[PDB]
Structures are given as C-alpha cells and as structure tokens.
Ligand binder design. Structure first.
Ligand code: TLO
Ligand code: TLO
Ligand code: SAH
Ligand code: SAH
Lengths: 239, 237
C-alpha cells in the first residue's frame, strides 16, 4: 500500500516512537519559529497532520489549532488524539476551509507525496490562501536530489505492551523520486506474526523547485538547513 | 526444509543471536575427552551448515557430518572443503565405520516424530560409536519447560546485508509449532521477505532416556548446556 491505511496507520505512531521521533521537541521548535515571524500568532493549521502528534503539542501554544489529512485511517487516530480540535478530511492540493491562520505547517516531508511541479505549486497556493497576511507558511521538504542516498537501508525494532514491531526500508532512485519499499513484521504472544508491506514514491524536488512554488504563491521564501529531520525547513511570508 | 534463501541466511541469523560455535566446539571437545581421552574422530549428525564441524576439525583427527538437506550440506561443504560430509537421514544411515564421538546438536533431534523414530536414531548413533566413545544429544525443550507464546526478534548486519528474524512459538499437540519470518535487505539487492514453519517434538526427559537405554547406552543429563535445554550423554555397554 501507499495510502497510510489499515494496519500501517495503526503501527505508525509506535514505529516512529521507536525511531526516536520527538514530537514534543519538534512542536516546541516549530512554535518558536512561528512566534519569531508572527509574534501575535493565535491559530495554526497543520496540513497532512497524519496521526495528530504535532497538533497535540501545538495546542498548548496556540488557542486554535486545526488539521487537514487525506487518509481517513490516519485522521481517525488524529481525531481521537485531539478530541477538542477541528480536523478536516482533505487534499493539500485543493482544500478550502474558509478561514485563515497565523501559521500553515506541513511537516515530515509530507510534501514529497506530491508528484511534479504542478501539484507542488497548487499545494503552496492553497497554503498561501489559508495564511494571515502577517503569518508564516512552514514546509519541511524531502531530501534534495544532491543529498539523496540510493541503496539506503533502515531497520528498527520496537516493543510496547506486548506487541513487537520490526520495520525495514530500502530506498532507490526512480526517475525524479525516491522509491522506498517498507516491510513490517508485527508479533505478539496470542496474535502470532503478521507481515505487511508499503511502497512509496517520494518526489526529489530541487531546492529551486520548492522556491518556485513559494514564489508563485506570493510568499517570500527562506531555507534553513538542519531542521527537525536533517532535511531543513522552508519558511514563506506573504507579501 | 532448510532450503533456498532460508538455508543461506542461517549462519548470519545465528551469529546475530550470539551463538558462539567456537566456544561450543571447545566445550564439546573437552566433554568428549572427559569420557574419551585419546578421542580422534567425530561424526556430527544433522550438521547443518557445518559450523561446529569447522571448529571441531581443529580438535579431532577426523570429523565427518551427516545432513538431510542438500542446500544446508552445500554450505557445509563450502565451509569444510576437506571434510567428508554425507547426504542422509539420522533415522536410517550406515557409514561403515565408527567414531570416538557421535554428536547431534542444537535440538535437531526434535525434528523426529514419536518414540519409534527417536529410538531408531539413537540406535544408529550407538551403532556408529566406538566402545570407548560417547554419544552427545542436545534435546529440544521438555514439555514442562516449554514456554507457549514466546516471541523472539533480532537483527544483524554483515557486509552491508541486514537480516531481521522474528519467531513465534505455540503448543501443537505434543510439539512446538514455531513460525519464523525474515526480512533481508541490502543496498543493491533490495528487500525480500521469507517465512517458514516447523513442528519440533516435545519429548519428555524419560522418552530421551528410554531411547538411549534401548540402544544400549548408559545415559546422563546435564541441565543448561549450549542453549538452556541441557545435554544428554550416552556411553556404550
Ligand atoms: C541520512 C539520509 C537518508 N536519506 C533517505 C534514504 C531513505 O529514503 C530515508 C530512509 O530512512 P527511513 O528512516 O526509512 O525514512 P523515513 O521514515 O524518515 O521516510 C519518510 C519520512 C517522512 C515521510 C515519508 C517518508 O532517508 C537520504 O536520502 N539522505 C541522507 O543523507
Ligand atoms: C527461554 C525459553 C525458550 N523456549 C522456547 C520458545 C521458542 O520456541 C524457543 C526460542 O525461540 P528462538 O530463539 O526463535 O528459537 P531457536 O532459533 O533456538 O529454535 C531452533 C531450535 C533448533 C533449530 C533451529 C531453531 O525456545 C522455551 O520453550 N522455554 C524457555 O525457557
Ligand atoms: N495530498 C495529500 N493531502 C493531505 N495529506 C496527504 C497528502 N498526501 C499524503 N498525505 C499524508 O501525508 C502524511 C505523511 S506522514 C507525515 C504525518 C505527520 N505530518 C507527521 O509528522 O507525523 C500521511 O498522513 C499521508 O496520509
Ligand atoms: N532426519 C534428519 N536427518 C538428518 N538431518 C536432519 C533430519 N531432520 C532434520 N535435519 C537437519 O537438522 C538440522 C536442524 S538445524 C541444526 C543445525 C546444526 N546442528 C547447528 O547446530 O547449527 C537441519 O540442518 C536439518 O536439515
């Protein structure tokens, strides 16, 4: 699969907890970035919010937080995690919520699930359409082509509460994208062992392709390297 | 049936579990010499990929192996190019000679079904041991020590190749049903999934002792041993 559904969606949080992803830390850094650019910020929209881990922590920093997510199964986990937030089922390429926000964020390389400049431009225009004029757009990109490592293998095992999950991924270059194949073994005393597979195309947009998408949406763009996952961060300001 | 890529993964997965065949071979050679000081030949039954044999060849004059799986035997033959390895069945084989020691390690004996097959294997072991030699059998778990629902998971990397292995064990009549899955991944080879399922018989201690006695061997059990399952030794007479 490629749609973050079913068993894969239910394993997502445990797998990334096992890999060391710290959403509390990332949310605090993201909130500080937002407050640096929009010092009276009060509202945030997290696009491709997945299971809602960032939003759960951002709600402490901003009086209104909302989310948008394409996968119904991810969205169901996010809604249970964030019962008091308004979350939306929808597509970052075309959504329309009828309000604006101090910040529009798109984290953890979700933007790489778009194919081609036309989809990238359309998403960035939607983000610009949802940001207040004194607000900020934040996009965590995928790897740039010059930084991509073909043949990369990641392997990790986590156990929690009687469930053991092992995850192995392999990445290769496929045209202008990463082809990443992911396999899971899920095990437990009563349930036995189950095997699951995922296969994704994640687009290797160049730095200049990202900057063009921000520019076409009317945002001034800046790239900061490092960031939450080693891939840096883009910030866009209206005007 | 220990074939194909599963056979080729065996050594890497057991290195990752920390199985130390060099130390087991040293301990086994010392055990044999406690019961047979001038011991100079050894037969390893169900020798698998020949890891014990490779280290035991440093301690004995002659080492030979017996193995049912052709794919395992080929790895054993690559690793032990100067040894004589036999394609055959522990329940019914005849090499035409005897050995100071006949060994059957790592619970291979648990692939037999029922007392009759167990007895017949032990009789073949006794037929191949010298009158001053020793038979060594590492058993599978006894029923009272078997742990249903056990999950094992381990990952190892060697030469750029990563192998992850997960097993699940359950009770199936008087046997353990063990399901094993592997994920194998390397930079150029990509990622593949493999799986296998085995029935490993839960013989009681008294059943093992019955098989040794019927073959004319005095029998003693040492708990603990290379795998936590103990070791049986048998002496002719
Ligand atoms: C150091 C490094 C890694 N990778 C690539 C190689 C490979 O594609 C990825 C491998 O690691 P895994 O931990 O399975 O990836 P995630 O779960 O973080 O992927 C997603 C994250 C977010 C959304 C979608 C997917 O990083 C590079 O391209 N360059 C690098 O320097
Ligand atoms: C502590 C303990 C374990 N087990 C069982 C539970 C489970 O069936 C097994 C341990 O699982 P794994 O490490 O996958 O087993 P191996 O690869 O050694 O099995 C092979 C045996 C012979 C040839 C090949 C493989 O021991 C018990 O029954 N009791 C115990 O106290
Ligand atoms: N076109 C699209 N519109 C909205 N969400 C999308 C999308 N394409 C992929 N996604 C979502 O992007 C997410 C990538 S995983 C990242 C989730 C979350 N931001 C986190 O940091 O954990 C998945 O939940 C997937 O369903
Ligand atoms: N009837 C039989 N005769 C000979 N070998 C057998 C057999 N039944 C199973 N086997 C073998 O027993 C082995 C169990 S795995 C143990 C391998 C080796 N003794 C080691 O310590 O690593 C496999 O190689 C399998 O092919």
């Amino acid at each position: 699969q490629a749609d973050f559904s079913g068993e894969i969606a239910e394993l997502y949080d445990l797998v990334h907890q096992g890999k060391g992803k710290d959403y509390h830390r990332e949310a605090a850094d993201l909130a500080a970035l937002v407050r640096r650019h929009s010092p009276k910020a009060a509202s945030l929209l997290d696009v491709a919010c997945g299971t809602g881990m960032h939003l759960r922590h951002l709600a402490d920093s901003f009086g209104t937080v909302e989310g948008l997510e394409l996968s119904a199964d991810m969205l169901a986990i996010a809604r249970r995690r964030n019962p008091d937030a308004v979350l939306h089922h929808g597509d970052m390429r075309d959504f329309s919520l009828g309000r604006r926000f101090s910040a529009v964020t798109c984290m953890f390389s979700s933007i790489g699930h778009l194919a081609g400049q036309a989809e990238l431009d359309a998403a960035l225009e939607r983000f610009a359409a949802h940001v207040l004029p004194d607000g900020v757009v934040v996009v965590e990109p995928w790897w740039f082509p010059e930084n991509f490592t073909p043949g990369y293998v990641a392997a990790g095992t986590v156990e929690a509460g009687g469930t053991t999950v092992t995850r192995v991924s392999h990445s290769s270059r496929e045209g202008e994208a990463t082809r990443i194949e992911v396999h899971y073994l899920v095990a437990g005393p009563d349930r036995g062992i189950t095997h699951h597979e995922e296969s994704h195309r994640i687009t290797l947009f160049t730095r200049e392709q990202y900057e063009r998408a921000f520019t076409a949406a009317g945002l001034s763009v800046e790239f900061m390297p490092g960031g939450p996952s080693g891939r840096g961060l883009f910030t866009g300001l209206p005007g």
